[model samples]
Target: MPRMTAVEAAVHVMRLEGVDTAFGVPGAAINPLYAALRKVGGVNHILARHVEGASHMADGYTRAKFGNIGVCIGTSGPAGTDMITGLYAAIADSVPILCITGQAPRARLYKEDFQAVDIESIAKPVTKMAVTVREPALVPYVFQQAFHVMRSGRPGPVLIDLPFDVQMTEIEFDPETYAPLPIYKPLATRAQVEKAMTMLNASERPLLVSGGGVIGADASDLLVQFAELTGVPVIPTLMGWGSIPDDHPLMVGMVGLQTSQRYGNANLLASDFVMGIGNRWANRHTGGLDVYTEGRKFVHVDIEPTQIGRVFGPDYAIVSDAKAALQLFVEVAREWRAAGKLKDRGEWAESCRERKRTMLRKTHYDNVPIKPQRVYEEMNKAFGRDVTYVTTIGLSQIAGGQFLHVYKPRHWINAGQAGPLGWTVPAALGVAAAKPGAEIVALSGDYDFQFMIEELAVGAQFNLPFIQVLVNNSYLGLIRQSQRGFDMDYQVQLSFENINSPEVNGYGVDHLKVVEGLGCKALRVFKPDDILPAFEKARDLMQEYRVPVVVEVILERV
Candidate 1:
């Protein structure tokens, strides 16, 4: 019988978790791990331009294909550091990803070696767990724990730091023998479920706010049924878009930053009761907690208890799995309705719609070079219910949230906590990878694209399918807009002509050239007339060849 090394155990773990693809660039320190990966043959290794980009791509894929875990790998030192921002993004947004890194050889413990840094310690702040596998036999167990933690309560990223010596060492490893951590139980409880149902039945004006928890729990259909059964309104967060059908009568569009009429926000704010099933009150969702709900009776149910009262005080808190909670709530609510104890809040629902129609319609574009609303309107027209829209942070998130009204839950994906700018392209790749054959759209600003340009190269290399619509305004459009709003006439917003700079930093770079240089399928629309046609073509290409494409929209500024 053959013994397994650390990388071999890692591969076995990946196979057990049903992972078919891995993303990240190869490094010298982890060369042994890369060799081991090649021997597995069950998973395909996707080379990203940078380690961070690879991690984000993995996150994007995991989010797009909920129930599926994605893997990202990197070497030690700077390479490990590259994964931090992306991992932080995953942890904040509740994206389930397993980030693996190679550390210095175990013999050099604490001694400063080449390309050596404490990856586990550095990642502790952002990951569900930062584990270092000193023993080769513990690799499978650590991987098991990492995956379990990533998918457990409030699903997030987990790190497993493998020393180079461990990867090269052989040990008796059995994939099936490892068990998850003793403290890692994620099942919903009966008492919490009963309480949730009781609250729903008791409130005359009740609302449902679904977040990434629904996807993490794979409860999209259940959420839809819950809304339909109770005649209760559903308001999805930016990340929760597409969890339900957008055109459903019970749907009140997106909540948080994109709330059109404050329809969803106001409904949540003024409701007698709110069922926050897997809903998290991140800053964007609360409109920085300034223009949103402050005082509302909320029954917050989440697998992770820490997220419950982190943002606002909940009237009742329940720790449980979203799917289990929804199923139990629905069952109990139905029982109550049969007994004539629960009533639909039709009048309050109508009032919420009216508010959405009046107050939350503030448009962010007025003669701007890149009209985000127009892009959303055109994209919506070009695509239908089957499309998933993934957007990066900065103006892309705000614009999509405000203008791109999703009819159902889980159709939209945006980073709420670690809103990385360059996440759009890779996330789009992940969505396409997870939901194969489905149309996917990515909205990103020029600056964000620059930050993770290597991701485009990765997409091209992997031949991933998706449409990237770059909102090109030639600068950090969000801050520029803010500055203009403050009468600070372009304080520091300018693109360069010839000098080179990193995509994330340096101002004034030609975004189109950078994307095209990456060998991606590229299209640029400078005029409004070209937007729809380009979008349609890109959508067709994604469905046809299952390869990624980029569409850059250059808008006129005021």
Candidate 2:
């Protein structure tokens, strides 16, 4: 075996486990690892403006790249802490991104050391595993385990903390001889799939709820096949939006109060049976359990056993990987159809389609300052079917979810669960990195655009081009929207009519100037008609300049 530094050994393991790119900011505590990465010379790195920026980039890269996990490195103290939001997003959405952080030397333990914190403890709640390597010999094994834990079961993120001294420690290891641990995902037996399919057949109007797990498992092909085989309408959760194409005849709408379609909600309420495959009946999707589960018979299938009854008990639950279960689901449905045992859901599906046509919210408003709906209407026209969207939480994402169209899994990359502000810019950069030469459009409110705006320079520097659609609605529009979700009195009582000024304080930032300053192109649109033209011009500018083009649309504050 060849002898190399522990950090080098760890880097070799990361490569063997399939990490080709990394995003991070280096510091003195982590200089040794950077030194090793530089010497090894295979993994590519993108410098981020902030540690958090790097973290989200890693998270976004993992999702965009699909099966391959993304990697982000940061130095000690606040560097590790900055990754919490990104880690929370991966854990919530079951995204597997590797987060590596530098720590103080082992000798500095319990003392007031500079840039030293208990990062492992802080990160444990949000990661599949969070640990600081204590021994040099364990470096390669720890990294191997990190990848294993990240890919296995439900597939979530993991963090491996390296102490300052440990990085320099010599370890005897040969990169060519190393082997990754075998991955583990629970498989659904033929009997279980038959039982679930039988239960689903009994109901007159049964719907299939596809969650992120299907996307994580890379089983979207099977998801669509199973849905088609059984003639079931597939209602993809926000995380699982791309499992089935939006235009698919049997593709029912997404359900929830926020980031949801009215038709999807109505269809759920009318249906008597729901078999949730790889979905976690999140509260937002359910809205309220009493109404969500009241008359519906449920059969939940997930990779993790604990997630089965975590929220509420299902009539029947099966623990298995999404792809594994979906495979058998398709198989059993095929057998039943061949034997003529399946029910005809043609009438029920047509009724749901009727609601889908009639229960839509208006998206053709002709408001002067531009209605948010109008923005989406123009967006649908400007961006093609292949466009991949990146966004975080805000009225921007909420409205985008409600009005915009997503046709494939991982196409609408978001951290809606964590609802982290300012995640759009960096994450979009990461996506652009993962899928170079692809059509990528990112949506953000003015506030979100300003959060980590400095990271725009990363895109400009790296020449990772994407179009950013920034909606300028001067107020805290998301909170305002949330308040409206409550009763009318609560909406008025908070900070709406009596306090904030839309005319005087509306659209407070000069986004075009800032975007230009960051070495990217910018175009401002004050009218709905101008939105598409600006978007068209942005596409030209993005290819011409080979940088990000920002289209700032001024919106009415209603």
Candidate 3:
């Protein structure tokens, strides 16, 4: 008979949960687990620059794959501490991530051994489930419960802290011995479903607002059906980019702080009933609570009960997996359609179209020097149809959210909550890697480009084809812009650290040189009239050479 160790049990848990890719840094505390992983043949591990980067990469992997779990491992003490920010990002954004860390052996546990810290205590608030597997026999059960809590409802990260003693100790436990915890309850009651339907049935001006929760739930099809059946317009939140086909007659595009100003704010204000599914009322989506949807009756459905009235309170809230609730709604709505109660609401449809037109008219980018609105308008004009847009967070995401007209949901990848500044380049690289035949574009703010610029090296190494459009304002444009709006002073937002004309190329110091130096064809855009040709050329090279390309555009602050 063979003896099993806690580390083996933990590895078994990962395999059972269907984790194929993990990102982490190798260190002393976690070397044993990493060694076990190397021996395991099924999963591939990505080596990250830092532990923090591992969490972020895992987050990106989860978001990009949708419903897939991502794993991250790190050593104890500093390694565990470094994961908090990234873990919080996953928690806030509702991403399913597993963070595993090592602890000093049980004998040295409370004696303050080298590199030892109370990891479980540090990660408690950030994870949906945080447990220290003290008993090797309980490893399987704890890990199974952890996986369930991560993906069952309002998905979030889970942390597993293992002491060295447990990792080295032997225990006899079968995988089947593990059963998921029954304590974590996610309720979607019949009464709550009835309340949602009653609100939908009663309202004349109803809007369906989809968020990332919709994407997480894989409920896009369901959302589309509901929109079509209700004859109501659809407006996805920033994180909810691909929840429904953007061109659907009912879609008014994404609603957020950065959504096109031409779209009447009145549309949101005047909505009688709002069905908020799978999305929290995030600040970026709501702008400010004071300025957000006021006097609107909201039916909020989320897997997390705390989210029901966390920010913008809901009149009726349903707590369950988004996919389940949406499926139920779709089923009931289909019956209504069969009864002829769900026919085309012509007046409502017309109103949605009118709002879209009004909003576009107001934010037209006629003037040159490349206004953010014009950047979107021209991109749409040039490749108006079906290009998969991968945009970085901050102003780039905001601009894309407002200006780009996506005909289909999922066409645009907007990471509103993750907001990892440098993710655009890497994410676009990943997107292109996955969909080789599709035309891929990475829209990034200059600052964001700096963060994940290293991924361009990955792109080059793999000979990946992708276009990176660097929207340069020479600063952290969004934060500075916010300062201006709220009458706050800016600090540490400048692009240059201490030197001027560092790599002068007329658009101030040359950003083009650095990009071109990295084996990518780099083009600088200063004239508004030159954008269309520059875009065409860059797109051509990106597809032609099957290599990463950069187009740096210098734009003045509005």
Candidate 4:
């Protein structure tokens, strides 16, 4: 065994646990860890403009690929606090990312040390585990446990706060013999799957609800297979959008109050039996639980044991990892179909198709100032199924959920819960970083774009190529939309009225110059027809220059 700095051992653990790149900002308290990173030479670093941006990048990086746990590092205080939103989002979405923060010297803590704050306690609520290491000898073990805690159970974010002194202290460790702890994921027994299948078979009309857990378990293929074997229509949750291709006949539209499809809600209302796999039955996805649960019997399956009854109690519930349960579901469903125990679901499946065909939200508007609906319409035509869409916390994403067509799992990256306004840009950079040379498209409204517009420089500096479709309707679109029936309105002073152009129309930011100044390219489109052409040109510039490209479409009143 060799003696090395504790930070060095932590880095070694991160490498063995499959972390190759980290996104963060460094400061005095964290400089030792940065030095260790530079010397160890395995984990690459991308310096983020903001710590919040760094955290969201890690969130996106983790969600982009299977078996990836994105890491982020920062010095003490606000750096750790800034990541709370990302932590919340990750936990809410069942995404696992490691956040490493430097803290005050063990003695200086609670003595008003500069940039020193109690972050572990703050992060604990949102993480599977958040701890501040007190002993140097425990550093490597602490890191090892962090990885284990992140990977096990429901798969959530973790924060490890290292005191400056603790990180500097020497620890004895051997990377050569290092092995990750055996992860624990509950599996559905054959008996449980059989009983659930029996209940499903007994129903007049049943549907499979695929959720983000299917994506986390790398079981999208299995979910689709099970759907095919049973001939049951599949309704993917917003997080589970890309798991089953939108074009698949069995893939019915999503269901919810918002971030939902008109046909999808109708289909759910029509469904008699819903077998929701690895989903939370989120409020956004299941507005008015009474209406959703009134006539339908639900069979809830989740990795976390406690999640089953948190939203609403299900008729039947199972505690199991998504992949393990999906494997058994496929197995049992296949056996039953062979035994002729399963019902012919063709009529129910066709009903889903008929509803999808007839129910339309009208995306073909030829409005002068361009309606938000038409943006996604052009997006579907301009970008192929290969494109990965990233968006968060805006009417843009809500509209996107309604209009976008996602074809592959991990292709629809989103901050499902803690919808931080600035999450889209940095997360897109992280996604591009994880999947280099992939087609990445990000959607954002005016306010969301302005929130972290500074992070675009990170994309240019790193040569990360992606297209940002900015919907400039002047104000906070999501808030404005949310305040619809209320007397109180969201943004009296929140709207932007800036620089003149034919398309500017008093309510805008000079995003074209702002984007170009950040060392990227930008194009403005006033007409709906020009949107596709601008998207084409934006893609051309993005590939040629290898930097982010923005297509700002001016919109009228929301």
Candidate 5:
């Protein structure tokens, strides 16, 4: 056995567990771990402007690639606190990422030392495992268990707090002989699959509800294959949008109150049976449960056993990993099709397609001071299926979900459950870092863009190239829309006159100047026709400048 600092052994374990890249802010307490990272030399690190931004970057990196567990590092107290939101977001969406924090020395833990807080306790509720390694010898084992916890069952985030003394203490460990623990995921049996298939085959109008689990399991192709074999339409949740190509004949619209499609809702209303795979029945997707479940019989399948009936009882439920369940689904569907036991669903699928075609929300507008709808219309034309779209929450994200098209799994990277503002810029940076040659496009409203706008400087500093589409309405667009119930706009407006930039009229922020100040290229479009040209210029500029390029479009208040 070789003797090395606990931090060094931990870094070696991380490399063995397939973590090659990390995003984080280094601080004094965590400097030893940083030094170890440098000594190891296999893991690449990107410095973030903010600790929270680093957490979101790690999140986005994990969501962008299969089996990739992004690691985020920070110091004690605020750094650990800053990651709580990211941990919540990752766990809520079943994304696997590791959050590492450096804490006060073991003896000084209760002395109220600077930046010394109970991070493990603060992060426990949100993470699969939140622990402080008190003994230096247990560091490697703790990390191995962290990886196991993250990859097992329903994937989620894990947090490990390393006290200063513990991290510095020397421990005997061998890097060459270290191996990751086995990951355990529940699998469905053949009988369960046949029963679900029987229920699905018996329905006149059946639909497949694909969720993020399918993407996390890398089973989108299996979902598509099962749908094709059964001739059933698929209504992908917001997180599962890219599981099937938008142009695929059976790819029906998404279902939700806000981030939903008109046709998707109609299709769900018309559905007689729904086979939900790897998805939670989120409130947004199942508004007024009575209405959503009135005529529909559901068979829920998920990896987490407790998730099966937590929302509402399903007609049938199975606990299995997405890939395992989807594999069984495809197998059963294929066998039934060959045996002539499957129903002909051509008419039902066609009906869903007809609604998809005719239930339009009017995107083609020639008006000046462009409509938000037109932004997406031009986006559909400008960006192809290969483009990877990143977004968090807002009218921009909602409308993007409504109007834009996604063709592949992991192409639509979104913060689904914890829709934190300011997540897009940092997350986009992470995606660009993960997929260097791929086209990465991010959508954001003015409020979302401004929340963590400083992260743009990180992109400029690191030379991460991506295009961001900023829709400026000079108001909190979603809140403004929601305020209609109270019949008052209240404090939702963000509009104000700027003496410096008269070009923006009454828009408060001189976004162009601010973006330029951040050492990145920016283009402004005031008319609908200019949107495409602006986006084209942005792409060219991104390649030319090797930094993030912003296409800011001014929009009408309505």
Candidate 6:
């Protein structure tokens, strides 16, 4: 056994667990962990401008790759508090990111010392596990359990608070012999699979509702295969956007009050039976439960057993990992196919495809200030299918879900459930960091772009190259749209006179100057035709400078 500080033991455990990259802001309390990270050279750390930004970066990094657990670090109190929104976003989307915070010394915990607060309690609601390690000897065990908790059952974030004195305390640990604990995931039984398959076979118009769990399980191919074997249309949720290619014949569309396709809703309405896999029946996806479930018989399968009927009870529910359930689905579907027991769904699938083709929201606007729809249209043409898109909540993301096309799993890295305003920029940087040399495109509205805009400096510093498409309408687009219901638009407008830059007309922020000042390139487009060309130029500039390039498109107020 070797004697080393508790921080060093924790770092060693992280190395063994395959957490090679981290993002965070360091302070006095957390400096020991930083020093340990430096001593253990395998782990790479990307400094963030804000602690919240760092948490979202860790989230994006984890969402961008399979088997990758991104770690975020920060000091006590505010740092931990700043990451609560990030933790909420991660848990809401079922993303696995480890959050580490440094706390006050064990003795000062109750004395209201500077930057001392109970972060563990604050983060417990959103994390699978949240604890403040009191004993230095338990640091390694805590980390090991964090990884296990994150990967087991329903994937989610974990938080570990290390008191300053505990981090500095020396502990005997053997890095050479350390190993991660065995992960446990529930699996579906053969009888359960058969029953579900029988119910699916009994329907004349069956559809498969694919969710983020399939992507998290790395079973998108299995999902597609199962859909094809059964000749069923697949409606992927917003989080599961890239599980099935947009161009896939069976890729019907998404269903939601917002961020949904007209055809997707129609298809759902027409569906007689739905087999939901690895997805929670999010409220947005199921707008009116009665309307969504009126004519549909649903069989819900998820890793978390509690999630099965928490929203609305399904005809049947199974608690199993998505990959395990999908594997069984494919197996049973194959057996049925060979035995000529699978129903003929040719007409039903074709009907869904027809709706997909015809239920088009116009994106080919020729307006001078540009319609937000045109931005996505040009994006579809400019970015390749493999382009990784990072975005959070806003009109931009909703429009993206409506118009943008995603082809591969993990390509659409979105904070699906918790739509934090400032998540786009930092998350994009994290995506670029995780997938070096890959085309990364980010979408954002003016409000979202400005929330944590300072994080753009991280990309400039790290040489993380990506293209951000900023649609500026000079208003809180989503809020404005929502306010229409109240017959008022007060306080939703962001437009104002900018004496600094008259070029933006009445737009409040001089985004171009701010982007340039941040050591990155930016191009502003006022015309719809210029959007594609500007996007093309942005790609070239990003490749040349190896830094983030923004293509800010001025949009007319809708």
When superposed on Cα atoms, how far off is each prediction in RMSD?
A: 5.0, 5.0, 5.3, 4.0, 3.7, 3.7
Stretches off by above 4 angstroms in model 2 are 258-264, 284-295, 308-311, 394-402, 475-507
Give one digit per residue, the lDDT tens place, for model 4 in 1-558.
Answer: 899999999888888888789999999989999999988888879999999899889999999999998898888998999989889988888899899999999999878788888897799899999999999989989999988898898899999999999999988999999999999999899999999999999998899989888999999999999999999999888888888999999987875443244424667778899998877665535444343556788898889757546445778889999999999999999899889999999999999998877666667999987888888899999998899999984344332234878999999998877778888999999999999999999998877888889999999999989999998886223333344653254345344434455543434458888899999999989899999999999989998999999999988775
Worst 10 residues of 3 by lDDT: 475-484
Encode model 6's per-residue lDDT on 361-467: one tens digit a residue: 66688988687778889999999989999887434434323478899999988887787999989999888889999999999988899999999999999999999
- Please give the clash total of every predicted structure, in order: 31, 2, 7, 0, 0, 0
Predictions in order: lDDT: 0.72, 0.84, 0.70, 0.86, 0.86, 0.87
> Which scores higher on lDDT, 3 or 6?
6
Question: Could you give candidate 3's per-residue lDDT for residues 7-81 as a string of tens digits?
Answer: 877787778677767777778778778766866557776665567767766765566566566688888778888
Q: Which candidate's lDDT is highest?
A: 6
Off by over 4 Å in 4: 258-264, 284-295, 393-402, 475-491, 494-508
Model 4 local distance difference test score = 0.86
**What ranking emerges by lDDT with the best candidate at the front?**
6, 5, 4, 2, 1, 3
Error of 3 at 83 (Å): 1.5
Candidate 6 has a TM-score of 0.93
lDDT of 5 by residue, 176-283 (tens): 889889889999999999999888988999989998889989999999998998899999988888999989999978765432444246787788998888876755
lDDT of 2 by residue, 1-558 (tens): 788899999999988887889999999988998998998888999999998899889888998966768898999999999999989987888888899999999999567699999998999999999999989889999999998999898788999999999989998988888898999988889888888887899998999888877888888999999888888998887788888999999987775443244423667778899888887665545544343465688888899867545445788888999888988888889889999999988998888888777666667777787888888889889988889999874344342234778887789898867857888999999999999998899998776788899999999999999999998775333333344564564345212332333353323356777788999999888878889999999999988988999998887773
* Model 1 misplaced stretches (Cα beyond 4 Å): 175-191, 256-266, 283-296, 310-312, 346-370, 394-402, 407-409, 475-491, 498-508, 540-547
Q: What is the lDDT of residue 213 in candidate 6?
A: 90
Model 4 is weakest, by summed lDDT over 10 consecutive residues, at 393-402
Looking at model 1, report the run of 10 residues with the lowest lDDT sum.
475-484
Model 5: pairs clashing at backbone N, Cα or C within 3 Å = none
